[PDB]
Amino acid sequence: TMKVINDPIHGHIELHPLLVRIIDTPQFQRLRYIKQLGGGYYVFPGASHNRFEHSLGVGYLAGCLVHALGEKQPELQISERDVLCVQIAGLCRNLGHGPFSHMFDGRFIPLARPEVKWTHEQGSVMMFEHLINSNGIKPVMEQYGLIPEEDICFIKEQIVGPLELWPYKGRPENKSFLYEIVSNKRNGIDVDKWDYFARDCHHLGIQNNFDYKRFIKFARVCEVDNELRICARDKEVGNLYDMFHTRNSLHRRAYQHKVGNIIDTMITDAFLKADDYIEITGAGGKKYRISTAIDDMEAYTKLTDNIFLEILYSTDPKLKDAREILKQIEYRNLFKYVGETQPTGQIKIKREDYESLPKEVASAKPKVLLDVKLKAEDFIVDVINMDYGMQEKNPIDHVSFYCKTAPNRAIRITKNQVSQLLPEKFAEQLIRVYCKKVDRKSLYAARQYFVQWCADRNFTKPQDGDVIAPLITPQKKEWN
Amino acid sequence: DTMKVINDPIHGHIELHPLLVRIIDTPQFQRLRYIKQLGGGYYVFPGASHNRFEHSLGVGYLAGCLVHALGEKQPELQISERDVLCVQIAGLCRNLGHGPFSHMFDGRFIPLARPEVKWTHEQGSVMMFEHLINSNGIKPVMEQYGLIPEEDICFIKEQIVGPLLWPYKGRPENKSFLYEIVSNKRNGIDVDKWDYFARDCHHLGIQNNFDYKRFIKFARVCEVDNELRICARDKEVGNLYDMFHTRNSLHRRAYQHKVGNIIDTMITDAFLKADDYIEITGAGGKKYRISTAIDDMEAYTKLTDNIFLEILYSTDPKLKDAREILKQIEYRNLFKYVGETQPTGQIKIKREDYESLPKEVASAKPKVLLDVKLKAEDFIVDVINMDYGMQEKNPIDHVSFYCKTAPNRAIRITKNQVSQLLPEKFAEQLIRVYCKKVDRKSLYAARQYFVQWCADRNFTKPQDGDVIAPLITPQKKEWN
Amino acid sequence: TMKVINDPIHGHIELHPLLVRIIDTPQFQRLRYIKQLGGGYYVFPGASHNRFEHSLGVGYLAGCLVHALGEKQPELQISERDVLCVQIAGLCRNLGHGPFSHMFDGRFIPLARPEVKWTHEQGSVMMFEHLINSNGIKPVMEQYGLIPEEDICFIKEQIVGPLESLWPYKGRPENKSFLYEIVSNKRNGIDVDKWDYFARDCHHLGIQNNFDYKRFIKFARVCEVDNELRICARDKEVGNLYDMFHTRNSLHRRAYQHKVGNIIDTMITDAFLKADDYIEITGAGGKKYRISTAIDDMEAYTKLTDNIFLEILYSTDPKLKDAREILKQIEYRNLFKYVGETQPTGQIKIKREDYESLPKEVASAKPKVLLDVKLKAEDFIVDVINMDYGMQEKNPIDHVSFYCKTAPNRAIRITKNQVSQLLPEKFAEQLIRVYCKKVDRKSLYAARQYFVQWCADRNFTKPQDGDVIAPLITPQKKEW
Amino acid sequence: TMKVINDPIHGHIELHPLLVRIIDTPQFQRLRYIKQLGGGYYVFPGASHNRFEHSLGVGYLAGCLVHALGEKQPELQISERDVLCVQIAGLCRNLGHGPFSHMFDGRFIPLARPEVKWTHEQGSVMMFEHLINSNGIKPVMEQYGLIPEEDICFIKEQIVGPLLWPYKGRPENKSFLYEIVSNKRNGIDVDKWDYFARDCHHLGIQNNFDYKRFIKFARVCEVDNELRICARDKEVGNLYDMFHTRNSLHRRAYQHKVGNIIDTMITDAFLKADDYIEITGAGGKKYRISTAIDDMEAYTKLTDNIFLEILYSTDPKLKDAREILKQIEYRNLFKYVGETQPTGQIKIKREDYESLPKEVASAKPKVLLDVKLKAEDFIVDVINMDYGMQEKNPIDHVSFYCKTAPNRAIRITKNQVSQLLPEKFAEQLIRVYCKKVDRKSLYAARQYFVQWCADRNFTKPQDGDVIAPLITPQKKEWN
Ligand SMILES: Cc1cn([C@H]2C[C@H](O)[C@@H](COP(=O)(O)OP(=O)(O)OP(=O)(O)O)O2)c(=O)[nH]c1=O
Ligand SMILES: Cc1cn([C@H]2C[C@H](O)[C@@H](COP(=O)(O)OP(=O)(O)OP(=O)(O)O)O2)c(=O)[nH]c1=O
Ligand SMILES: Cc1cn([C@H]2C[C@H](O)[C@@H](COP(=O)(O)OP(=O)(O)OP(=O)(O)O)O2)c(=O)[nH]c1=O
Numbered sequence A: 001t002m003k004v005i006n007d008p009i010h011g012h013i014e015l016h017p018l019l020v021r022i023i024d025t026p027q028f029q030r031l032r033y034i035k036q037l038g039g040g041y042y043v044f045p046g047a048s049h050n051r052f053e054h055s056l057g058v059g060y061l062a063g064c065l066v067h068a069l070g071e072k073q074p075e076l077q078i079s080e081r082d083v084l085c086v087q088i089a090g091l092c093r094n095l096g097h098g099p100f101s102h103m104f105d106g107r108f109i110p111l112a113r114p115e116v117k118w119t120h121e122q123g124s125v126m127m128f129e130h131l132i133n134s135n136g137i138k139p140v141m142e143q144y145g146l147i148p149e150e151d152i153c154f155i156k157e158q159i160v161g162p163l164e165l166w167p168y169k170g171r172p173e174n175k176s177f178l179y180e181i182v183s184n185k186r187n188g189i190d191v192d193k194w195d196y197f198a199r200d201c202h203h204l205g206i207q208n209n210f211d212y213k214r215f216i217k218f219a220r221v222c223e224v225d226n227e228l229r230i231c232a233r234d235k236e237v238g239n240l241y242d243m244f245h246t247r248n249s250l251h252r253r254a255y256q257h258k259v260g261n262i263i264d265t266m267i268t269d270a271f272l273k274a275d276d277y278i279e280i281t282g283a284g285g286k287k288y289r290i291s292t293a294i295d296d297m298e299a300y301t302k303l304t305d306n307i308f309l310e311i312l313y314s315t316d317p318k319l320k321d322a323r324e325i326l327k328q329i330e331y332r333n334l335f336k337y338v339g340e341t342q343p344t345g346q347i348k349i350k351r352e353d354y355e356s357l358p359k360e361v362a363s364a365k366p367k368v369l370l371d372v373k374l375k376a377e378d379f380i381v382d383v384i385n386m387d388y389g390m391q392e393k394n395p396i397d398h399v400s401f402y403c404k405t406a407p408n409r410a411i412r413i414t415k416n417q418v419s420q421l422l423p424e425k426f427a428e429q430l431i432r433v434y435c436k437k438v439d440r441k442s443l444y445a446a447r448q449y450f451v452q453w454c455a456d457r458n459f460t461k462p463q464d465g466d467v468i469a470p471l472i473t474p475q476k477k478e479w480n
Numbered sequence B: 001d002t003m004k005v006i007n008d009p010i011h012g013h014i015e016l017h018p019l020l021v022r023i024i025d026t027p028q029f030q031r032l033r034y035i036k037q038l039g040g041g042y043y044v045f046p047g048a049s050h051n052r053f054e055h056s057l058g059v060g061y062l063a064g065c066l067v068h069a070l071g072e073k074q075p076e077l078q079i080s081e082r083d084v085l086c087v088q089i090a091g092l093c094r095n096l097g098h099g100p101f102s103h104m105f106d107g108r109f110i111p112l113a114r115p116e117v118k119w120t121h122e123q124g125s126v127m128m129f130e131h132l133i134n135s136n137g138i139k140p141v142m143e144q145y146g147l148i149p150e151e152d153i154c155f156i157k158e159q160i161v162g163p164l165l166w167p168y169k170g171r172p173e174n175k176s177f178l179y180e181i182v183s184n185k186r187n188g189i190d191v192d193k194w195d196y197f198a199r200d201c202h203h204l205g206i207q208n209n210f211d212y213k214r215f216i217k218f219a220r221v222c223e224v225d226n227e228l229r230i231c232a233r234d235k236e237v238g239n240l241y242d243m244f245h246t247r248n249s250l251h252r253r254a255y256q257h258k259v260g261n262i263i264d265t266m267i268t269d270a271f272l273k274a275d276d277y278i279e280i281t282g283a284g285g286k287k288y289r290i291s292t293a294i295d296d297m298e299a300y301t302k303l304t305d306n307i308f309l310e311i312l313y314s315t316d317p318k319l320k321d322a323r324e325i326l327k328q329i330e331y332r333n334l335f336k337y338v339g340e341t342q343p344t345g346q347i348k349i350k351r352e353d354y355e356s357l358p359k360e361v362a363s364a365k366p367k368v369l370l371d372v373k374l375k376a377e378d379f380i381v382d383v384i385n386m387d388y389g390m391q392e393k394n395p396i397d398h399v400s401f402y403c404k405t406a407p408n409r410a411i412r413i414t415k416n417q418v419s420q421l422l423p424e425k426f427a428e429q430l431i432r433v434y435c436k437k438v439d440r441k442s443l444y445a446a447r448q449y450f451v452q453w454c455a456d457r458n459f460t461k462p463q464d465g466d467v468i469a470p471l472i473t474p475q476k477k478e479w480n
Numbered sequence C: 001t002m003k004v005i006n007d008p009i010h011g012h013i014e015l016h017p018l019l020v021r022i023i024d025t026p027q028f029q030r031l032r033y034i035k036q037l038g039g040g041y042y043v044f045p046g047a048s049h050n051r052f053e054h055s056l057g058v059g060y061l062a063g064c065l066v067h068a069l070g071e072k073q074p075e076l077q078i079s080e081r082d083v084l085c086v087q088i089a090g091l092c093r094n095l096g097h098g099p100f101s102h103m104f105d106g107r108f109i110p111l112a113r114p115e116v117k118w119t120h121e122q123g124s125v126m127m128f129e130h131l132i133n134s135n136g137i138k139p140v141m142e143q144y145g146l147i148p149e150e151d152i153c154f155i156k157e158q159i160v161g162p163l164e165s166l167w168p169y170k171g172r173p174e175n176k177s178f179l180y181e182i183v184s185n186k187r188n189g190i191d192v193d194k195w196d197y198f199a200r201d202c203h204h205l206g207i208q209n210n211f212d213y214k215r216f217i218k219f220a221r222v223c224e225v226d227n228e229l230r231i232c233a234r235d236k237e238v239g240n241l242y243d244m245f246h247t248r249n250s251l252h253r254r255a256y257q258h259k260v261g262n263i264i265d266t267m268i269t270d271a272f273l274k275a276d277d278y279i280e281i282t283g284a285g286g287k288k289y290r291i292s293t294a295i296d297d298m299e300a301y302t303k304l305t306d307n308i309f310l311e312i313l314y315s316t317d318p319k320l321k322d323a324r325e326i327l328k329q330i331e332y333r334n335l336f337k338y339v340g341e342t343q344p345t346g347q348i349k350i351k352r353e354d355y356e357s358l359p360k361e362v363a364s365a366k367p368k369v370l371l372d373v374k375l376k377a378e379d380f381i382v383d384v385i386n387m388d389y390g391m392q393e394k395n396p397i398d399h400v401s402f403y404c405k406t407a408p409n410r411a412i413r414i415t416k417n418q419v420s421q422l423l424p425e426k427f428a429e430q431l432i433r434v435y436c437k438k439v440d441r442k443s444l445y446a447a448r449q450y451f452v453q454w455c456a457d458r459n460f461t462k463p464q465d466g467d468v469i470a471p472l473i474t475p476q477k478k479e480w
Numbered sequence D: 001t002m003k004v005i006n007d008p009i010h011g012h013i014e015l016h017p018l019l020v021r022i023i024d025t026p027q028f029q030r031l032r033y034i035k036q037l038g039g040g041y042y043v044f045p046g047a048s049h050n051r052f053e054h055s056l057g058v059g060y061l062a063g064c065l066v067h068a069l070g071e072k073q074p075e076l077q078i079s080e081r082d083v084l085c086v087q088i089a090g091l092c093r094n095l096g097h098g099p100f101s102h103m104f105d106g107r108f109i110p111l112a113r114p115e116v117k118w119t120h121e122q123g124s125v126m127m128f129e130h131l132i133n134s135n136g137i138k139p140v141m142e143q144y145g146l147i148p149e150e151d152i153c154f155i156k157e158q159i160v161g162p163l164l165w166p167y168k169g170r171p172e173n174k175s176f177l178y179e180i181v182s183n184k185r186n187g188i189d190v191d192k193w194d195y196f197a198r199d200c201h202h203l204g205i206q207n208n209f210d211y212k213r214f215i216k217f218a219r220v221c222e223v224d225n226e227l228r229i230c231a232r233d234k235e236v237g238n239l240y241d242m243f244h245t246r247n248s249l250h251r252r253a254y255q256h257k258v259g260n261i262i263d264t265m266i267t268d269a270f271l272k273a274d275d276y277i278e279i280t281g282a283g284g285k286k287y288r289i290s291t292a293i294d295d296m297e298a299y300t301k302l303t304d305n306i307f308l309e310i311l312y313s314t315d316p317k318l319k320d321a322r323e324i325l326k327q328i329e330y331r332n333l334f335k336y337v338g339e340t341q342p343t344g345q346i347k348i349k350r351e352d353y354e355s356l357p358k359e360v361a362s363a364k365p366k367v368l369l370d371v372k373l374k375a376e377d378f379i380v381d382v383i384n385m386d387y388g389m390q391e392k393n394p395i396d397h398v399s400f401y402c403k404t405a406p407n408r409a410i411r412i413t414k415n416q417v418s419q420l421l422p423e424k425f426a427e428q429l430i431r432v433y434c435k436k437v438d439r440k441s442l443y444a445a446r447q448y449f450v451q452w453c454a455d456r457n458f459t460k461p462q463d464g465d466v467i468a469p470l471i472t473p474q475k476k477e478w479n
């Protein structure tokens, strides 16, 4: 039988018994202990929500879209088997997230294990495999008409893309539109965003959203270059632009909030300091570190936001340094935000260069009297890539549309056909600088270094530059 | 008289000072209950039943909130209760001048019915305001509550319509910031937008709006070029860009919906056909027409959306033609939307040229076989100016900011200091074409004329151009 | 073909072309000019909504429920024909409402035409026929597979009940009995009409309360009950059903029967009575009707809407001076004054036929207090309001069938004692409001004395403010 | 300066710097790790919210109400000092909650430490004292004009009541201030107002109390020789609705049958872990889950984390505790059998709760059964549902005023309002569950249960005729 669940975003949602079986596992229930926005909760107190409930939402919306396409276009031959596979992929696409979500894969792993190339998407696939095998799900899949060999492959492909011509093995070209629902590699328009827009806004207290219900009603499948793809109605093109504008707004105001990011940074530092001493038991009783738990799904299953509290509540002297950082978070003695700037023209900063940047800021030499002299280790420089999901490219150039007068005929719509008030660029970098020395004099010094460093590098003038560094800003003619 | 509490679905329970209640409980104000905020938009968005009355309450309330907030935070501004009430009254009364179907009346009907005259709802609001005050003995009531009618009436009118050197007489330069609350001529950031974003979204069914409560909390007054102005906190700049983006979204999706506009056009047409025959009694028993009721406020008081029904329910044979158009609206036999295009690059179309455009479309000679030949009178061409409120200018360039480290010091923030993902242009024109002949063949013909016309004029390729006019689009090399 | 409409309560809803044909008629579109809450708009400014949009909502929810039952239980043999008939009945159940909705049938007609018995439900049926016959809808119905003779009967029965046991309906047989429970549930009043108005009225009034109908639809099933197939609710929903009726009563108390909204309805009714001789409405064959006789000709009734209010207000004819003066008093907020509220004690119930005598009784009370002025029957208005759970003294939940998870096909009854001791022991009551047409201070004071004396004389409940408004009277009654 | 914070329920709220100092302490931040609804999150997935954000809301609303009263009635002499003390009490009233909130004081402590009498309210006062002393807050209070000796007493009194006019923190002329945060007279306070709105937002139930309306109509009047908060007469129906809503929310959410069983399972796991888990308190001294309430330094570190510490443990001593939590993750929960209520006169005492599983197991249904069940196979959960004041009507303990005499307080009786109101204001619900989840065990449990209801003259379970068609006929009253 169906289970009904009340979700505050989507209302009462029905879950097929197979989905319930997947949900009621330690691998899935784990998502209850991982905050969707990580350190954002420490800035937006409404953002208490966890990955668990977001995953239900994604699974539900995936089901909505595939059901809608099937109702409208029986000739697509969408089967219940297809519907369940799409729902399962929707449910399980977040399985791979670690403590504090993007902090873990965005900050901690890159620093702890630079050799490795690792993403929550890969984690989701591994967790999914572990979930299936640990809980005897394959037999249950067969009971409901699924074919595990093909369908597990199809599900993994929906999350992570080809495990590698038509590159997919889980389904053929005629069902290509199914791969656009959960995680859309072509243009990023998928049900994951649609849930998190609505859920995050509900919790953050921001009244913004994408109308996904409207979008689903106007979605159709058409042939595009000998593939069946999801097409949007021509009139939806402006709403799609708005969708990405919203996404960017949410990153600016919330996901990349300057303080939420510094808290993530502080937690990451604490995890690095604890990484040698914390042990997580995996398969065979055998022990992993925070940074190696990714190698064993049984261990990774037990790696959640709980680690934060394990460190905070520890008494072991080896963890004193890690614990001290978290204590500073509770007292709100955070690293201090100094300012924000951007690279000018086409200058872009490489990931490998990130390490050198604190050194560059400390090297600056402002022509101002300073009580204190700061060092590289006193500065944090956070570089944030902001885009429309596709680096420099416009995702709407990778969207196919149809018109009311010829619903089967797919078309392209260029930016110029829509509006001159749209963005001319679709990617940029933000640079935030913080100082670990929080006293008045240290902070004043840090401002001088920072603004001097912006000038030296011909970055943009910080918005408060004339107030925080009135002696420095006059030197740069461009600024005034 | 005592203070009144009223439950508004947008703002909750709001308190109204007895003076404001006296102004509200007049025929001149209550009239606004019978004018739809969005006019013909109700005929596309069925939730948009709301009238100008309740919007006016909201504007008055928010005007009060902002001025109170400024006073609390900065006593040195010397904001008085008298100032607060004047600002609230201007907020309440700013919409008094709207006519039937709001912007239809101002924007479409009067320009066509009385081209000699130059008329705006803003001017109407001032005239109505005067009429309201004098007809209802409000001046004595104003003095009772500490207002000085000569100065304060002038101040209120100036807030609505601008000046009738420091050009204002109602308040001096030290109180300049008060003129920025109700109708902000400098940059358009005022409480009117804040109420209509939230109210229209609530009714339309679209999730958006601007967080005005947040904005009020971060608003301050600072000296700018020897004037005291409202300044926003530096960190709010992105939210201000977002405010205008939202405004433009709402215009695109709702206020300029292609069908809501054609319904307004049809109603305008019916009013033109009824203008000779409908009589409205004004001062001294003198009779006016729909188009001349603007000259006498006693008459204009009785001119509301009711005239629509007076025409629809008429039996007089003189009104048969007007009545037939409205009947077509009820049967949904509307003029048919042919398409949309834009001028390319810097071309702009003047208001005086609008008349000639249907002639131009009818003069296009598409190289296609047509059964039927269309005439100028068969075409409607609607030209819509879409901007950020200041024609080609960026309103954020006319905003002053302050930073946390020096709250009294105003600064400027340029677009390059905020984001490269912002618009490079801030005004554009949309051109919609419709046809009054609704049969299949007439419509097909209209499409060919339209696309040919776009090509001839080097306008943008209509989004569905290749589908509606496959023979025409190939000729233009630019289009493909 | 399908139309999509954005409703702020339900989101994007699809309408089948047949329903669109019904909607795009003067008989339907008329509902755009009738306020859902009538005079309530004059108390809650958000309540600008009209019967039109509510009707779309009812039609949509009727569809949702019937679709849900069909998905879950294919063995019911629900056909698309069934679905459309249920939707049409949902759309059309409000067609019979007159100006200001319940004012018209609840106040005006009873007073203008006491000989006649008339209800909006009967109006809806008559309007429905008129709509079908005037617009050639029967052929269109046949085109989509409907059988007009049966189906029109079925639709009318859904609105108004049987047109004259064991099975009293002709439009559908006992096996389809559950379909008659969707639009207007005569058995217990649990239907989609309430579900829409709770959510819509709350959204507009600014009250957060509503009933979770989407939850209810998910738990609804059809079971055999006494050889009929009926809708049954899950046992666990019984408390939510009690809550549904509590919400209904809350809404009546706070809004639909707000003391001032009611007095405004009363004033408008008085104005209509005074205009009834002079206003003419053209019906079939050019024949002329009055406001009170337009109910006899649907062509005339089609043109009878809230517009009449403004026609009276804006009139210059001296015959209409008295009517017009009443409406003018409404605009100035010079209303009949609320004196107080009381209830009958224990057994006592007051009949509609007695309503005329009550003002006489109040005027006959002889308070032992010094009075400057002496009041007459004609100076008093006594409004008696019946508040119940939809079924006079009866508990509607006693007329609900439930099922349990362990035997889903087995219908059961649940008594009040099986649910809670905190529920109501009675399900009907009366409120008595008294108002005075003389608004001066001395007249009002006198009215209060008559009123409280009258309450004491009749052993009604002590008005809440009784000791404040009549400190000399309340001591005489020992109980109080 | 003021901090501004965006709360999804209240919007942008300003926090005075003193309140920020109190918030940015381990004692306060601890509330981030305690779910407001405990096991309810396991039934309503939207209910992720913690006590922390609820406490911000309560503090804000406390400020709103006191500010409103001050604006409207300057003659009350409400000072900024008064405002801050009321806000602090609002912020800090939830400080004393333990893991999974009401589970801890409602289920676990009573079972683990029956000799002790403990409430989260007492915990809040103890935590508050610990917070102040540990973080040097007293000097900061004086900096902003507070007088710690009087004002700390006043704050504690607001949370827990008195430690003649029985209060020492403020005099009788300021008595209305004690009605804002935790209203002992009738329960109408800002704590409910926040949790109604916040819980509804998260649970997905569009129900609520309009507290903004209420605040606008609230006034202080003399009642007896006390200054009290009085509501406008017209708000009486809203106040009845407020308690109806409260009871609705308890029925649908806070006492959800499955949420309660999960709380019961977690409590059981804690009891099994209580001997083995150690929490370091003051002086390096070690405490147990059940004794951490004696030392605030230890209690500071006692949060929902303990659930995961047990779940992730490898120690064999914790196997039994860990197994129970593992069953929760697999959703192998004890099964709900049914619900019943005592009839007429009858009420069940707390001391009798233990015996009830024995009584159910002792019922002898006249039906053929494959399996025989034992006392230990049954859980019987007895829930007292009321309007906050046992049998009493809280509206009888509310004072009102009318628009014609705003300074004259009055009473409004139930009969003056409506005959559709409740005639009783307290009742008991009895839920029975079975630890044996198989088909045959279930079927047996249902027979025992319904027989037991019959034997005890309890109400007929709603599905009684379906689950026990052989049993229900014997009882004439039922049919
Ligand atoms: C009882 C109830 C539950 N809910 C929510 C909580 C859950 O997320 C979801 C399902 O809860 P329930 O409907 O209570 O489902 P259940 O599994 O507890 O009962 P059973 O298996 O006997 O049918 O609905 C409400 O929103 N409102 C309510 O009134
Ligand atoms: C009674 C009531 C009114 N309202 C709304 C309707 C109105 O817009 C607003 C004020 O209505 P009321 O509070 O009814 O005020 P009133 O002027 O009718 O009564 P009095 O003059 O005696 O104080 O509040 C609610 O939102 N909830 C309620 O429970
Ligand atoms: C354009 C648009 C419309 N709406 C609403 C307004 C209407 O109620 C509903 C239908 O609007 P449209 O989708 O614009 O439908 P249409 O009939 O105008 O277009 P076409 O016939 O070419 O398909 O959608 C939105 O909610 N958001 C939007 O962006």
Ligand SMILES: Cc1cn([C@H]2C[C@H](O)[C@@H](COP(=O)(O)OP(=O)(O)OP(=O)(O)O)O2)c(=O)[nH]c1=O
Binding pocket: A043, A044, A045, A205, A206, A252, A253, A254, A257, A259, B214, B235, B239, B404, D004, D005, D006, D007
């Ligand atoms: C930036 C931003 C924050 N918020 C929320 C997040 C926080 O809860 C709250 C405060 O955030 P900020 O206003 O960013 O406060 P801050 O302390 O980071 O900035 P500063 O100290 O420089 O003044 O507002 C929004 O709602 N919208 C926004 O656009």
Ligand SMILES: [Mg+2]
Binding pocket: none
């Ligand atoms: Mg009033």
